[PDB]
Scaffold this active site. Structure first.
Site, PDB file in Angstrom:
ATOM      1  N   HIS A 189      -3.303   5.736   3.854  1.00 21.63           N
ATOM      2  CA  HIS A 189      -4.053   4.543   3.469  1.00 21.63           C
ATOM      3  C   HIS A 189      -3.378   3.270   3.968  1.00 21.63           C
ATOM      4  O   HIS A 189      -4.020   2.415   4.591  1.00 21.63           O
ATOM      5  CB  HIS A 189      -4.227   4.492   1.962  1.00 21.63           C
ATOM      6  CG  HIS A 189      -5.477   3.793   1.549  1.00 21.63           C
ATOM      7  ND1 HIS A 189      -5.720   2.471   1.858  1.00 21.63           N
ATOM      8  CD2 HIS A 189      -6.577   4.242   0.900  1.00 21.63           C
ATOM      9  CE1 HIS A 189      -6.902   2.126   1.377  1.00 21.63           C
ATOM     10  NE2 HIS A 189      -7.444   3.183   0.797  1.00 21.63           N
ATOM     11  N   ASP A 230       0.837  -1.197   0.000  1.00 21.09           N
ATOM     12  CA  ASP A 230       0.000   0.000   0.000  1.00 21.09           C
ATOM     13  C   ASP A 230       0.875   1.252   0.000  1.00 21.09           C
ATOM     14  O   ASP A 230       1.934   1.251  -0.624  1.00 21.09           O
ATOM     15  CB  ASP A 230      -0.932  -0.049   1.212  1.00 21.09           C
ATOM     16  CG  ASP A 230      -2.200   0.742   1.014  1.00 21.09           C
ATOM     17  OD1 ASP A 230      -2.152   1.768   0.303  1.00 21.09           O
ATOM     18  OD2 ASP A 230      -3.236   0.355   1.600  1.00 21.09           O
ATOM     19  N   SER A 286     -10.900  -1.429  -0.385  1.00 24.63           N
ATOM     20  CA  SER A 286      -9.573  -1.316   0.189  1.00 24.63           C
ATOM     21  C   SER A 286      -9.608  -1.487   1.706  1.00 24.63           C
ATOM     22  O   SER A 286      -8.659  -2.022   2.287  1.00 24.63           O
ATOM     23  CB  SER A 286      -8.975   0.035  -0.199  1.00 24.63           C
ATOM     24  OG  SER A 286      -9.996   1.023  -0.213  1.00 24.63           O
ATOM     25  N   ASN A 304     -13.612  -0.223  -6.176  1.00 26.13           N
ATOM     26  CA  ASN A 304     -14.691   0.654  -5.735  1.00 26.13           C
ATOM     27  C   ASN A 304     -15.457   1.248  -6.911  1.00 26.13           C
ATOM     28  O   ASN A 304     -15.821   2.421  -6.906  1.00 26.13           O
ATOM     29  CB  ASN A 304     -14.147   1.771  -4.843  1.00 26.13           C
ATOM     30  CG  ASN A 304     -13.438   1.244  -3.615  1.00 26.13           C
ATOM     31  OD1 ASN A 304     -13.849   0.241  -3.032  1.00 26.13           O
ATOM     32  ND2 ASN A 304     -12.377   1.939  -3.194  1.00 26.13           N
TER      33      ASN A 304
END
Length: 279
Positions: A69, A39, A224, A161
């Site tokens: 994130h 990430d 996520s 998403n």
């Protein structure tokens, strides 16, 4: 063990029913397992990680998570308060820059990095990779995820998403890894969550509280965010001896809460990650 007033996602994966606030889990808490969080990085200094996080690789000068994130998803795996596997080891692989962006090649390199890196680590209960990222379909991204899985890492990936079929997204569409959709606290499919036959499992993904950069916390939403729930759960279940890296995805689906989610498009599994813990 029981964590009262836990994030709804933690309580959800330990409950056959929504709306509870207590996270029930075996105290092993994923100890002896490791999870690579692939990430934007991990603020390993966050008190919520208790020194169980560390950066092992970056593809930018800095291993520092200047986005949040990666720290957030690391937090959901095994941060202290917000994590599924509260005693697992977290390894940070920063394939996404601080804007959250990453070239495919870099993401592929990060996955190949984990596949060998895990041989320099002590993870006697097994190894998980949580990939809270994604872009359009890429056979080379998919095959990178497939290799990582093949190498003996439990790969969990976000479905994406896009409120679309996840077949058009990578690594979400790689069949051999665990493709995670997102649910909200009312057991609805998340508004944004991708769907399709490639999805293996749903996890809490809407309004997920976890760690953030600057020693803070915040709630954000995305497949996520559902991904680290499943990676944490796999690390937890591996530590318990209940499954292996190769079988964890199917073991989590076998033992999931079935049929409890709403707005699941026909042809998409109706399976919510559940630790089946009996306190």
């Amino acid at each position: 063990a029981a964590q009262t007033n836990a994030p709804w996602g933690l309580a959800r994966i330990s409950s056959t029913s929504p709306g509870t606030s207590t996270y029930y889990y075996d105290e092993s808490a994923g100890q002896g397992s490791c999870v690579y969080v692939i990430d934007t990085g991990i603020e390993a200094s966050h008190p919520e990680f208790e020194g169980r996080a560390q950066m092992v690789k970056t593809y930018y000068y800095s291993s520092r998570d200047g986005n949040g994130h990666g720290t957030h998803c690391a937090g959901t795996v095994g941060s202290r308060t917000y994590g599924v596997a509260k005693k697992t080891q977290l390894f940070g692989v920063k394939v996404l820059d601080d804007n959250g962006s990453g070239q495919y090649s870099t993401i592929i390199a990060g996955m190949d990095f984990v596949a060998s890196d895990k041989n320099n680590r002590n993870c006697p209960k097994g190894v998980v990779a949580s990939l809270s990222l994604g872009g359009g379909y890429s056979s080379s991204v998919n095959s990178a995820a497939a290799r990582l899985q093949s190498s003996g890492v439990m790969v969990a990936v976000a479905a994406g998403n896009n409120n679309a079929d996840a077949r058009n997204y990578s690594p979400a569409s790689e069949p051999s890894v665990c493709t995670v959709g997102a649910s909200d606290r009312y057991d609805r499919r998340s508004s944004f969550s991708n769907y399709g036959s490639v999805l293996d499992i749903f996890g809490p993904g809407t309004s997920i509280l976890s760690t953030w950069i600057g020693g803070s916390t915040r709630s954000i939403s995305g497949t996520s965010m559902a991904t680290p729930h499943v990676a944490g759960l796999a690390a937890y279940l591996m530590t318990l001896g209940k499954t292996t890296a190769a079988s964890a995805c199917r073991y989590i689906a076998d033992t999931a809460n079935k049929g409890d989610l709403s707005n699941i498009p026909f042809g998409t599994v109706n399976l919510l990650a559940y630790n089946n813990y009996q306190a």
